[PDB]
Short mmCIF file of N, CA and C in Angstrom, two decimals:
data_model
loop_
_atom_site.label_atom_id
_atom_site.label_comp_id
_atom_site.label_asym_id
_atom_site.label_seq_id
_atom_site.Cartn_x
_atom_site.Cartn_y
_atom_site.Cartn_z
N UNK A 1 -43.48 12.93 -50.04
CA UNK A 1 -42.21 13.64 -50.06
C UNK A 1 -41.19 13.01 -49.11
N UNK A 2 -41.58 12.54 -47.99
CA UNK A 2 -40.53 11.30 -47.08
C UNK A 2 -41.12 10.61 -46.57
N UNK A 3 -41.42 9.40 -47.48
CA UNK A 3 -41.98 7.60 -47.17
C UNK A 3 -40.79 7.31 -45.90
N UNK A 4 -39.76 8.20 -45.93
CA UNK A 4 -38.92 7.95 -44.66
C UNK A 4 -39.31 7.85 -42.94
N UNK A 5 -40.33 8.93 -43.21
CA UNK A 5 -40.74 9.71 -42.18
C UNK A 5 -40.81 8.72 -40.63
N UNK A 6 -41.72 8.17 -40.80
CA UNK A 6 -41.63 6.88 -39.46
C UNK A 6 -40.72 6.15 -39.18
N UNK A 7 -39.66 5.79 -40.21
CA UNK A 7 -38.71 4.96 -39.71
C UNK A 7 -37.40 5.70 -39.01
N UNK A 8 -37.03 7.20 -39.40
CA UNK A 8 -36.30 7.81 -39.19
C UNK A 8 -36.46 8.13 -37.37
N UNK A 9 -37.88 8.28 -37.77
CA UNK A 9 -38.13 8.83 -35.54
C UNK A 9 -37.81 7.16 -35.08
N UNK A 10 -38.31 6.24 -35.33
CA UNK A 10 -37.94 4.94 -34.71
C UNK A 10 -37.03 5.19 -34.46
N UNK A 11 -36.24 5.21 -35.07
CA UNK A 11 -34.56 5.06 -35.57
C UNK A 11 -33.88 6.33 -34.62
N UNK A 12 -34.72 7.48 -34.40
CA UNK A 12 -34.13 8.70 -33.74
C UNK A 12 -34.61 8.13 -32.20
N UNK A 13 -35.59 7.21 -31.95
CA UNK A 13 -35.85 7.28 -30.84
C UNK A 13 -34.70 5.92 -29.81
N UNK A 14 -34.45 4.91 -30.78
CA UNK A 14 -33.03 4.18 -30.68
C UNK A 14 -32.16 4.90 -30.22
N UNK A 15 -32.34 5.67 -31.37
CA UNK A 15 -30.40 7.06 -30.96
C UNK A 15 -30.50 7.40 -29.64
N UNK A 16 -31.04 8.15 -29.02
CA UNK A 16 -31.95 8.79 -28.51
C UNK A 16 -31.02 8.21 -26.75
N UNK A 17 -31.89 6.91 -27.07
CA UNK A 17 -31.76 6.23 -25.81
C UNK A 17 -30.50 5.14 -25.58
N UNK A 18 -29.94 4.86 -26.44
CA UNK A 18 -28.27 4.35 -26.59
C UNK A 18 -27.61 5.22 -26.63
N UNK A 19 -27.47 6.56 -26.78
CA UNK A 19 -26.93 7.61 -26.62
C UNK A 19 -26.93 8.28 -24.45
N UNK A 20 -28.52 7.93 -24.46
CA UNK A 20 -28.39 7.92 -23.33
C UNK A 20 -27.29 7.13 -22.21
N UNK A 21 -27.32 5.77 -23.06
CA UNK A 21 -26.48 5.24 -22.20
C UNK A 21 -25.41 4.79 -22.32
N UNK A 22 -24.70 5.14 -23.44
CA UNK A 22 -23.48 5.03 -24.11
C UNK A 22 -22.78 6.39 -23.58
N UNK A 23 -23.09 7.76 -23.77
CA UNK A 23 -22.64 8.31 -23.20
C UNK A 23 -22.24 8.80 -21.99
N UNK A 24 -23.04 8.48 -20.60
CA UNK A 24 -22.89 8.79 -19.73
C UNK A 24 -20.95 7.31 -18.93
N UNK A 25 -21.20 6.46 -19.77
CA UNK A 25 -20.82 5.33 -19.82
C UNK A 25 -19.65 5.68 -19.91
N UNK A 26 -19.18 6.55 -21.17
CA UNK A 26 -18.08 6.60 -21.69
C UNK A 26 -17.44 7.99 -21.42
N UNK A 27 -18.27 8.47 -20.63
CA UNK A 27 -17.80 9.78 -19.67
C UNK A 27 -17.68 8.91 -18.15
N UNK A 28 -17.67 8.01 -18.14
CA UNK A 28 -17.46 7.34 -16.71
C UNK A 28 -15.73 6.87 -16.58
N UNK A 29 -15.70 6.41 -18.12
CA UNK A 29 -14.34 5.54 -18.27
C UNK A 29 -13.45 7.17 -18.41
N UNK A 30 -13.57 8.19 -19.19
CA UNK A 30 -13.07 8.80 -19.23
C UNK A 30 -12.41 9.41 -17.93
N UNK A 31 -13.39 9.68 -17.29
CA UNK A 31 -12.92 9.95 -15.51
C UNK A 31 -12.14 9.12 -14.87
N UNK A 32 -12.22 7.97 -15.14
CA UNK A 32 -11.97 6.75 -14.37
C UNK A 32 -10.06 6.94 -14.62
N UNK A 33 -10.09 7.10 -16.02
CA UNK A 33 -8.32 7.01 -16.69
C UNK A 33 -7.84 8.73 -16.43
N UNK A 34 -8.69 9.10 -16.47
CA UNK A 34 -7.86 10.83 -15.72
C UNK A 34 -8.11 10.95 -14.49
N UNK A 35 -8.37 10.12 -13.57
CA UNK A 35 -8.66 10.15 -12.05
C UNK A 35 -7.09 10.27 -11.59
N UNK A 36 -5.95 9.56 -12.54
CA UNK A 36 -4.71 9.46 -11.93
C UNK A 36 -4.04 10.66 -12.13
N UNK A 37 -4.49 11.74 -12.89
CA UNK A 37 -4.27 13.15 -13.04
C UNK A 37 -5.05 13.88 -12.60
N UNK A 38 -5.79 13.72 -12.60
CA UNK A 38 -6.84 14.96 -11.51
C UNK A 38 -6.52 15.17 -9.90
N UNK A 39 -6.26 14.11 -9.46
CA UNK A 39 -5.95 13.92 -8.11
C UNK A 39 -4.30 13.99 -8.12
N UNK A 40 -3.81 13.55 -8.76
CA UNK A 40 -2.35 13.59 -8.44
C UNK A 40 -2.12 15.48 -8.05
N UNK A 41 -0.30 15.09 -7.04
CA UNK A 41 -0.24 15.79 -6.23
C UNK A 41 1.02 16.10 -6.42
N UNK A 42 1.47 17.50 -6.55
CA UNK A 42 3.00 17.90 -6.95
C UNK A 42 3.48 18.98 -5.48
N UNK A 43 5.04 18.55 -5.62
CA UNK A 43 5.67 18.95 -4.67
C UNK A 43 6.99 19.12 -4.86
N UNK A 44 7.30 20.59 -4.72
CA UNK A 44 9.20 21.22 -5.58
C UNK A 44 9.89 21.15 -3.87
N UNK A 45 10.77 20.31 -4.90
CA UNK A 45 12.04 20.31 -3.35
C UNK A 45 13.31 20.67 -3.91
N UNK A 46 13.59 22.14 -4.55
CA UNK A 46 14.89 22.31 -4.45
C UNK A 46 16.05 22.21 -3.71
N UNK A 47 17.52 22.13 -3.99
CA UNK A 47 18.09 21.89 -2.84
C UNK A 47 18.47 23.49 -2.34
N UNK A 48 18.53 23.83 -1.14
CA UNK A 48 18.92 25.15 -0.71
C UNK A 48 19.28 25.19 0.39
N UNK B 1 13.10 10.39 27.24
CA UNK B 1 12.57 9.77 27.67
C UNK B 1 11.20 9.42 25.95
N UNK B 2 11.53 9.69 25.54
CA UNK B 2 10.91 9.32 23.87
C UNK B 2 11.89 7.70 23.83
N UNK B 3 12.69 7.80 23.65
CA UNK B 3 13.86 6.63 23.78
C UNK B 3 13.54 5.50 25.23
N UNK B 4 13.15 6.25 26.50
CA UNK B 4 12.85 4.76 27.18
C UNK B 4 10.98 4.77 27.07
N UNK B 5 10.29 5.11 26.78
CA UNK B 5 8.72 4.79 26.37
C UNK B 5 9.12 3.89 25.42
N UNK B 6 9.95 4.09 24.50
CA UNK B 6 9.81 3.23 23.16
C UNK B 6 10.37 1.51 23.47
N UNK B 7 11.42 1.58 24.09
CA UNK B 7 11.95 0.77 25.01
C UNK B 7 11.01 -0.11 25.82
N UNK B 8 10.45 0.83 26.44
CA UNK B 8 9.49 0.41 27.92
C UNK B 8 8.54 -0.39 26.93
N UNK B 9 7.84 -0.10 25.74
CA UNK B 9 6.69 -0.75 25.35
C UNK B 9 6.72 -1.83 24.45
N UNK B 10 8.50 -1.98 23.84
CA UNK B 10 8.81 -2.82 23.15
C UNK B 10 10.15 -3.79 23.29
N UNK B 11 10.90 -3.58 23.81
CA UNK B 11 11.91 -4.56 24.57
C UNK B 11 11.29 -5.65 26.07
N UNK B 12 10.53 -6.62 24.96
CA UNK B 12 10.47 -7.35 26.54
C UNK B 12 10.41 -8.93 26.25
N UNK B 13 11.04 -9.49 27.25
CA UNK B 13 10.91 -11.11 26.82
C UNK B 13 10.23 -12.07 25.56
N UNK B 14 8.89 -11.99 26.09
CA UNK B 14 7.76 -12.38 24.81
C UNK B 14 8.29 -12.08 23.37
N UNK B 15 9.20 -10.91 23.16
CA UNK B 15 9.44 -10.59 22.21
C UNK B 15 10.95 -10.69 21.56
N UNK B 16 11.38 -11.58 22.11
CA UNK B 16 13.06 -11.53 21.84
C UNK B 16 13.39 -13.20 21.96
N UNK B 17 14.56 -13.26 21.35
CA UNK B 17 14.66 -14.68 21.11
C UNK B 17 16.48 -14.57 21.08
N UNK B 18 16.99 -15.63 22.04
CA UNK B 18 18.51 -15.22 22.28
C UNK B 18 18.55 -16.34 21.03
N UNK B 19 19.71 -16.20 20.11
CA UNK B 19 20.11 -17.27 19.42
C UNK B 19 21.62 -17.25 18.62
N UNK B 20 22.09 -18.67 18.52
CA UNK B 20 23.39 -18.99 18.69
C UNK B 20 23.73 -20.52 17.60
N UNK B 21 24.74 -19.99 17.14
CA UNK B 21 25.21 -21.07 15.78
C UNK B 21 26.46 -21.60 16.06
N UNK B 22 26.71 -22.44 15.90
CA UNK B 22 28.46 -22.87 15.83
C UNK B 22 28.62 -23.78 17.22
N UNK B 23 29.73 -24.20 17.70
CA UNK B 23 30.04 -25.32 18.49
C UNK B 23 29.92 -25.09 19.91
N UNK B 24 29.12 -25.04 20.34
CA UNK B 24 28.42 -25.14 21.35
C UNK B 24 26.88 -25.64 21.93
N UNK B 25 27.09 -25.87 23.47
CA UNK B 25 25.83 -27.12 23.12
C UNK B 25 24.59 -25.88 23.97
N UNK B 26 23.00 -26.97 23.64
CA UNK B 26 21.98 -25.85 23.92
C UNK B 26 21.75 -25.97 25.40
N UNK B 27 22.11 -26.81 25.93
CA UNK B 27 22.18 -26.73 27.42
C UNK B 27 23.37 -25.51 27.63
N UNK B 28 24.39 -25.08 28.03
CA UNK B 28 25.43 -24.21 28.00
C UNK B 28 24.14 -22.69 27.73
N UNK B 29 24.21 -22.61 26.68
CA UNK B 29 23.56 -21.57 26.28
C UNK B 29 22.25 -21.09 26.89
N UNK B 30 21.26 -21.91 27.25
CA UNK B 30 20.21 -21.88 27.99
C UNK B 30 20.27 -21.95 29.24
N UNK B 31 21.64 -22.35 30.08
CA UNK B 31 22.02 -21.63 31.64
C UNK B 31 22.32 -20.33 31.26
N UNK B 32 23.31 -19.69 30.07
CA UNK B 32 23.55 -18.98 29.80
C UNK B 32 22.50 -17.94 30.42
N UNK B 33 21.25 -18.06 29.77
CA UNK B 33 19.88 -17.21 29.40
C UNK B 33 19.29 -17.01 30.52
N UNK B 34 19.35 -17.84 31.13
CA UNK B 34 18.68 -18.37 32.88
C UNK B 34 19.69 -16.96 33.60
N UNK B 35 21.11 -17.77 33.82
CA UNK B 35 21.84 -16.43 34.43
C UNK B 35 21.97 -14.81 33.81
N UNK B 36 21.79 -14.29 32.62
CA UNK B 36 21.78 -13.18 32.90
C UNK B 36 20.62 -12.74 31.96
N UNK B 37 19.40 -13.18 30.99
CA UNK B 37 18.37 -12.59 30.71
C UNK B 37 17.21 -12.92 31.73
N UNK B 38 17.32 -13.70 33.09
CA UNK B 38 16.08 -14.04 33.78
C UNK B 38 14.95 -12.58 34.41
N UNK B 39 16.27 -11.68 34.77
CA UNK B 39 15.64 -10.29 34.93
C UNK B 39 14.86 -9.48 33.74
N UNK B 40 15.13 -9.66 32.34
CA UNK B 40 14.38 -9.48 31.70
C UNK B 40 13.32 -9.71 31.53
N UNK B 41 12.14 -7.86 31.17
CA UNK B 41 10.74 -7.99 31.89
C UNK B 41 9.95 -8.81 30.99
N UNK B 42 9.34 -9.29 31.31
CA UNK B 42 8.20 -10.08 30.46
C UNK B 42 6.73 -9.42 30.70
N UNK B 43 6.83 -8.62 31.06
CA UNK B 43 5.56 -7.72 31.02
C UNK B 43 5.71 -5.74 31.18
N UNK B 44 4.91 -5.43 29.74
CA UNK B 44 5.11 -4.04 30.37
C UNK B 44 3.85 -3.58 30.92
N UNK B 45 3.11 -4.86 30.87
CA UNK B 45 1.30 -4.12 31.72
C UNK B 45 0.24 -4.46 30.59
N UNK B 46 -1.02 -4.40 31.39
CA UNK B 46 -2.01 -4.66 30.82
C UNK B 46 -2.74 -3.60 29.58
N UNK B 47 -2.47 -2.47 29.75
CA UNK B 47 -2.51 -1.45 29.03
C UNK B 47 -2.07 -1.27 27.97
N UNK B 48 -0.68 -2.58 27.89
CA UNK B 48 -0.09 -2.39 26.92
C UNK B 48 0.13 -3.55 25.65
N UNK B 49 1.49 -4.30 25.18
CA UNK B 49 1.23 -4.95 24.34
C UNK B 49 1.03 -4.53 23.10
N UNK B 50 2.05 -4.20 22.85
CA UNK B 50 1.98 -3.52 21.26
C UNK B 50 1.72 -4.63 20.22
N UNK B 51 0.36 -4.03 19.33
CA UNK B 51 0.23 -4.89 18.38
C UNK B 51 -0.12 -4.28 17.36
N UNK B 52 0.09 -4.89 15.86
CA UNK B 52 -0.11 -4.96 14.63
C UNK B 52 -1.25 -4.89 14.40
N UNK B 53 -1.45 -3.42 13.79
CA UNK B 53 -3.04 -3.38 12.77
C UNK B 53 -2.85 -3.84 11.23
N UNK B 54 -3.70 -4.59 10.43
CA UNK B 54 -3.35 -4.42 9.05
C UNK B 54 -2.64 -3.25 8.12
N UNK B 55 -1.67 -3.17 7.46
CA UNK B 55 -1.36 -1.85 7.10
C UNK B 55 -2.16 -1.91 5.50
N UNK B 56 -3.00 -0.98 5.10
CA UNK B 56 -3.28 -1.20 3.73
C UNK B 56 -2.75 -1.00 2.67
N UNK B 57 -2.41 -1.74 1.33
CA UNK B 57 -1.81 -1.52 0.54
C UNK B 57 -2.64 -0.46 -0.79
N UNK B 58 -2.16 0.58 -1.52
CA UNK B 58 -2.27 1.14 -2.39
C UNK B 58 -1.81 0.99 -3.37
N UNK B 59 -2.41 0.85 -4.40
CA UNK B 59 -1.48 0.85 -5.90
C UNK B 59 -1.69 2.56 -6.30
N UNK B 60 -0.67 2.97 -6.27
CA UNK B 60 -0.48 4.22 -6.31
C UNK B 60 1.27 4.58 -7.25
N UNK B 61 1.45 5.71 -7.25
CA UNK B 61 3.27 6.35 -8.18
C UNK B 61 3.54 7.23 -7.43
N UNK B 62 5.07 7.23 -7.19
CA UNK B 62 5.75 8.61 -6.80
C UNK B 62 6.69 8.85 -7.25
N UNK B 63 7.13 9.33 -8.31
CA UNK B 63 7.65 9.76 -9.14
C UNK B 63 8.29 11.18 -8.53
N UNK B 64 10.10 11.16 -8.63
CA UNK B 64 11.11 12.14 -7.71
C UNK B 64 11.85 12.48 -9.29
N UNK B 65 11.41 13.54 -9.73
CA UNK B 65 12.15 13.63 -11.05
C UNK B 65 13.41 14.84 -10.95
N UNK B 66 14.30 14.02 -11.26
CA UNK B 66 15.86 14.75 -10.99
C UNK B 66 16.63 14.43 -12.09
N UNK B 67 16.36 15.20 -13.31
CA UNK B 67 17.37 15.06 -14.05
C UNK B 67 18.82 15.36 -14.34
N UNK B 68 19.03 15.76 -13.20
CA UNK B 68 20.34 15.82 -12.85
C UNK B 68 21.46 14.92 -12.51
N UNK B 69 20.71 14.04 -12.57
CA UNK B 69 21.07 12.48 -11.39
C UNK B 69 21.42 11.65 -13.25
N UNK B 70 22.66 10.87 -13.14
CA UNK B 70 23.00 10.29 -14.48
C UNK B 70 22.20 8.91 -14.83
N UNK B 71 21.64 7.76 -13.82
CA UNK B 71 20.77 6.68 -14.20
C UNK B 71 19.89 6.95 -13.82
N UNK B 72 18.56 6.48 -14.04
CA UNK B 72 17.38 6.37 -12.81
C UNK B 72 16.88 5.15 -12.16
N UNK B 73 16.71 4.97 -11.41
CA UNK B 73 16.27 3.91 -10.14
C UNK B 73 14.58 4.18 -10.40
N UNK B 74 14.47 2.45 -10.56
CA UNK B 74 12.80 2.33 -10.85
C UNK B 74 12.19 1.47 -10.09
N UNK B 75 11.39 1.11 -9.06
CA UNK B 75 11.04 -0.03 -8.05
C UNK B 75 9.90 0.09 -8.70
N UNK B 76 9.00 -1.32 -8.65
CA UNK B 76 7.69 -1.70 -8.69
C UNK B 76 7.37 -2.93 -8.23
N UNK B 77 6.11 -3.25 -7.47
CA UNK B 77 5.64 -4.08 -6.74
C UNK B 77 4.24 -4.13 -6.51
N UNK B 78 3.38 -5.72 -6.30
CA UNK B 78 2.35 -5.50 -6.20
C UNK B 78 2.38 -6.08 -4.99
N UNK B 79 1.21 -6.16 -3.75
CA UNK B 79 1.01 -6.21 -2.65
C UNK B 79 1.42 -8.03 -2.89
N UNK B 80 2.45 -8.35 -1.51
CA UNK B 80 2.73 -9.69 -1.17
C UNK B 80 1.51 -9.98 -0.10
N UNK B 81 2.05 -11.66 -0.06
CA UNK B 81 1.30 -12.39 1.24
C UNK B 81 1.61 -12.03 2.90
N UNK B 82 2.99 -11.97 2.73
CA UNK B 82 3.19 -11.51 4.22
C UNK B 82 4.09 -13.40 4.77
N UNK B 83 5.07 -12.77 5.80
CA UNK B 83 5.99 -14.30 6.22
C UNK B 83 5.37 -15.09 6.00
N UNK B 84 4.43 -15.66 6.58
CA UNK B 84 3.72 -17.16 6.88
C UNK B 84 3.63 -17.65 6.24
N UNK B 85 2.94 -17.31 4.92
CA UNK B 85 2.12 -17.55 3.56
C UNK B 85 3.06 -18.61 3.17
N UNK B 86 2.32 -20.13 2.35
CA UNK B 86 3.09 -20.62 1.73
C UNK B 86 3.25 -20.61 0.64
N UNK B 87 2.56 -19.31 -0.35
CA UNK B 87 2.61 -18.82 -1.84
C UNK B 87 4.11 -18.59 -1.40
N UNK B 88 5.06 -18.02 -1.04
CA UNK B 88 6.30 -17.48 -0.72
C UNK B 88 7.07 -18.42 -1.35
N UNK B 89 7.10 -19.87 -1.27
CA UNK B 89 7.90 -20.54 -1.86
C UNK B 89 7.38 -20.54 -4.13
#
């Protein structure tokens, strides 16, 4: 019923672990390019 | 006395240089210096000696948003060499 069966977990166990490190990766860069908004710093100077 | 500390630790010989362009000769000018900068101190003490720490550069924005104002003024720069350097030329 799935002659698939073994190649799919191979294949899930690939995912698996490039996922591991693709994602943490690309949550790194993400931080990295909103670091200049997260930290930035605002300050109102009306005149009065 | 904010005004003579600042004075006291930075007006002193070592650090000043009399100088002069146009028709006159460097002998003249250097009795000049003799007669009335010779009293000038050349020391404010051992304690002292003001000197230069590296200042560090940041690449950083500061952004003053006034739209009220009719052009806007935009500066940008990346960190230079500093006098000496002969990248300058």
């Amino acid at each position: 019923a799935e002659p698939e069966h073994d190649h799919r977990k191979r294949m899930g166990l690939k995912m698996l672990l490039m996922m591991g490190l693709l994602l943490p990766l690309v949550y790194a860069m993400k931080r990295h390019k909103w670091s200049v908004l997260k930290s930035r710093k605002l300050a109102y100077r009306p005149p009065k | 006395a904010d005004l003579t500390e600042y004075l006291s630790r930075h007006y002193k010989a070592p650090r000043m240089v009399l100088a002069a362009a146009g028709g006159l000769e460097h002998r003249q000018l250097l009795d000049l210096a003799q007669k009335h900068f010779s009293g000038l101190s050349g020391t404010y003490d051992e304690d002292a000696v003001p000197t230069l720490s590296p200042c560090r550069f940041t690449g950083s924005q500061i952004c003053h948003r006034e739209d009220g104002l009719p052009l806007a003024h935009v500066a940008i720069a990346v960190e230079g060499p500093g006098w000496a350097h002969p990248d300058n030329v």
